[PDB]
Amino acid sequence: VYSSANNCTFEYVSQPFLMDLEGKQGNFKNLREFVFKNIDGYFKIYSKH
Amino acid sequence: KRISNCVADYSVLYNSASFSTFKCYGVSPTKLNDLCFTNVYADSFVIRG
Numbered sequence: 001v002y003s004s005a006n007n008c009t010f011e012y013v014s015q016p017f018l019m020d021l022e023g024k025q026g027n028f029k030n031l032r033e034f035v036f037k038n039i040d041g042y043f044k045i046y047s048k049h
Numbered sequence: 050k051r052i053s054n055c056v057a058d059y060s061v062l063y064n065s066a067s068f069s070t071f072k073c074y075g076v077s078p079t080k081l082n083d084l085c086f087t088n089v090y091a092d093s094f095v096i097r098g
């Protein structure tokens with residue numbers, strides 16, 4: 001995902017979330033929407049499965 | 050060390066009863082928790098007596 005890193009301050013973990021790593025070629029069964037905003041530097045997350 | 054997006058209590062930093070010395074200038078030590086600042090910078094290094 002990257003080569004290296006030097007310095008930073010923020011790091012967030014929150015609750016664990018599980019996926020399925022097996023990929024198929026069938027029809028989709030879920031829909032996920034995400035909204036990313038930045039007002040006065042504040043980062044916003046909006047999502048609902 | 051940079052402390053950001055955190056909330057902390059300085060009462061537990063004082064009741065340790067193990068610090069040989071403590072000086073704290075620019076603000077009264079009894080009235081610093083209620084006062085609100087923006088960022089806290091902390092540096093750690095060793096020194097002789």
Ligand SMILES: *[C@@H]1O[C@H](CO)[C@@H](O)[C@H](O)[C@H]1NC(C)=O
Binds near residue numbers: 006007008009
């Ligand atoms: C990280 O290091 C760079 C030097 O390349 C410096 O410009 C930057 O201010 C540093 N970031 C912090 C948060 O100290």
